[PDB]
Structure formats: C-alpha cells, structure tokens
Amino acid sequence: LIQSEEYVDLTFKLRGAPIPLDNGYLTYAALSRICPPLHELKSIGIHPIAGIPTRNNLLELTAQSRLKIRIYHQQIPLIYPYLAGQAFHIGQNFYQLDIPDYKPLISSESVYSRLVIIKGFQDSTNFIEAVQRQMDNLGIQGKIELLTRQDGTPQRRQLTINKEGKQFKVRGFGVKISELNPEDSLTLQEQGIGGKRKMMCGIFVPATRSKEEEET
RNA sequence: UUGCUCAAGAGAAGUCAUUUAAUAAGGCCACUGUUAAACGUAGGUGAGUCGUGGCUUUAUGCC
C-alpha cells in the first residue's frame, strides 16, 4: 500500500519475432549494444518478459508483452535517449521500442522472484541459508518459500551466457517470500536478492506472478 | 364351369457425316474537407530447468 520513491519501472512495449524463453544474455547484450551506458550501471534490473509460452524453449511476444526496467529515477536520463524510440536486434530479428511508461513500485506483503542466482550454492538448504544471510545483510525479516512444480520439488532454472565461443552454465532457484511488511517489501523489491540483476533474474514481483508460475 | 376352354405383334436396324460469332470501339473530361480553438486538472497488468566456467579474498557480485 506504499508506493516506493526513487525507484520506478520503465516499461517499453515490446514486439518482434518469437524470442527464446531464457533470453538473459541475449537481451542484455542487445541492450548493451544499443545503450553503452547500460553496461556500467549498478542498481538496475530488467524484468522477465511477460508473454505466453510457445513450442520448443521459445517465447512469443504479445501486445501485452513489454520490456520493463527497474532503475533509480534519477538515472533514467542516462539510458532514456538510447532506448526510447530506438530498435534492438536479437539474433537476426529487429525489435522496436516506443515511448516508455513509468510504473511506481508498489508494496506487497508477499513478493515473488522467478529466479535467484547465488554463486556456489546449488542445494536447497545452502541456497536457503544464503538467502537468509543476504536478508541479514540488508536487514529484511521474512519467511522464504521455494516455488514448486506439479511434483512439489523446488524449482531450478538455468541461465546461459554465450560469452565468446564458449557457452556458460549458471543456475539458480525461484523463491517466494512473504511476511515482509510494506517498508521491507519495498526495500527488497528495489534492492533485489542474489546476483545477475540485469540478467533477467533476481528481481522481485508480487505473489500473483508466483501463483501464475506455479500453474505452469 | 362364363361367345367360354388354348392363344408372345414377334425377330433386326448408329440420326449420321461437315461448319471460327467473327470482325471495331479511351468512362471520358472539372473539383482544397474552407474558417476558429489553452487539457483542463486526477480511471492499471498473463509464467523455464536441473550439480561452477573467465575476473573478483571463500566471501559477494561482474561477464
């Protein structure tokens, strides 16, 4: 019920060819090529693209699919002229961005993260204690829950970094966090958890997305 | 047993051979969608895969 200040969500309407579901490095590299200043930013995160799943491991862009960027509101003039109205290419297809819209950062009792990556922690217990430690670093109190598939197993996801010729394997979990109160909820949403925040992972969304991801 | 009782109009046959509905034609010439305005002030979101790889002190984050 509290709208966070100093942090907004720059949302660009996204359209183009069907896109891989594990975009990650693809989208980040395309934006970096379009926007050189995006590489050197620190407290910025890119939202997972919202669109229905298509065949293979691809993702199809809808009219409701939009590229959303979480950024300090004073740092917008550093990336706005490079992104607003410009076009970026993923592979061989051209994708166009229009004038973005600003969305305030709303507080929620229960927040959700698609994907949390912590270096060197692969098992569930070590991952959970690592996220507890990360909460302790930023002073947030809450209960950690892990998203589960239809079988109840904790969910794992993989991030593919195609740096140079070799391709890289970086993996993490998808958590659901509640019992946060609005102030700490906003603090967690702005700061995020884990690493690879610009890498389409580590950011937090309300728990409606948590249930939606739990569906499929 | 009925002006009745019985009682095949039956056998066979190509409507055939040949013929351009053809020669010619502009839906054409003309048209302003003219003229005027303070944004005043308050309407929201749909979804994967599975056991360390180049930097960085394990840390913890970058590619």
Query: Strand B: which bases are under 7 Å from protein Cβ?
Result: 44-53, 55, 58-63
In whole angstroms, B8 C1' to A203 CA is: 106
Q: What are A26-33's contacts with CB under 8 Å, separation 24+?
A: A26/A90, A26/A91, A26/A162, A27/A67, A27/A90, A27/A200, A28/A198, A28/A199, A28/A200, A30/A88, A30/A89, A30/A90, A30/A95, A31/A83, A31/A88, A33/A88
- Is the CB atom of residue A43 positioned under 7 angstroms from any atom of strand B? no
Q: What's the half-sphere exposure (Cβ side, CA atoms, 13 Å) at A25?
A: 11
- Name residue A175's beta-bridge partners: A146
| Beta carbons of A148 and A115 less than 8 angstroms apart | no
Cα separation, A193 vs A30, whole angstroms? 24
CA A6 to chain CA centroid, nearest Å: 19
Cα separation, A195 vs A179, whole angstroms? 22
- Other C-beta atoms lying within 10 Å of the C-beta of residue A177: 25
| Beta carbons of A112 and A118 less than 8 angstroms apart | no
Residue A14's nearest CA partner among A86, A62, A56, A85 is A62
Cα separation, A60 vs A151, whole angstroms? 26
Cα separation, A66 vs A62, whole angstroms? 8
Whether the CA torsion A116, A118, A122, A123 is positive or negative: it is: negative
- Nearest nucleotide by C1' from A161 CA? B63
Cα separation, A147 vs A114, whole angstroms? 8
Three-state SS across chain A? CCEEEEEEEEEEEEECCCEECCCCHHHHHHHHHHCCHHHHCCCEEECCCCCCECCCCEECCCCCCEEEEEEECCCHHHCHHHHCCCEEEECCEEEEECCCEEEEEECCCCEECCCECCCCCCCHHHHHHHHHHHHHHHCCCCEEEECECCCCCECEEEEEECCCCCCEEEEEECEEEECCCHHHHHHHHHHCCCCCHHHCCCCCEEHHHHHHHHHC
Expt. technique: cryo-EM
- Nearest nucleotide by C1' from A213 CA? B47
- Quote the tokens at residue A49: 């693209």
In whole angstroms, B11 C1' to A204 CA is: 105
- Other C-beta atoms lying within 10 Å of the C-beta of residue A182: 15
In whole angstroms, B49 C1' to A104 CA is: 31
- Name residue A89's beta-bridge partners: A94
- Quote the tokens at residue A106: 């709303």
Residue A104's nearest CA partner among A184, A190, A209, A192 is A190
- Nearest nucleotide by C1' from A62 CA? B46
Q: Which residues 6+ apart lie within 8 Å of A111 measured at CB?
A: A176, A177, A178, A180, A185, A188, A189, A204, A205, A206, A207
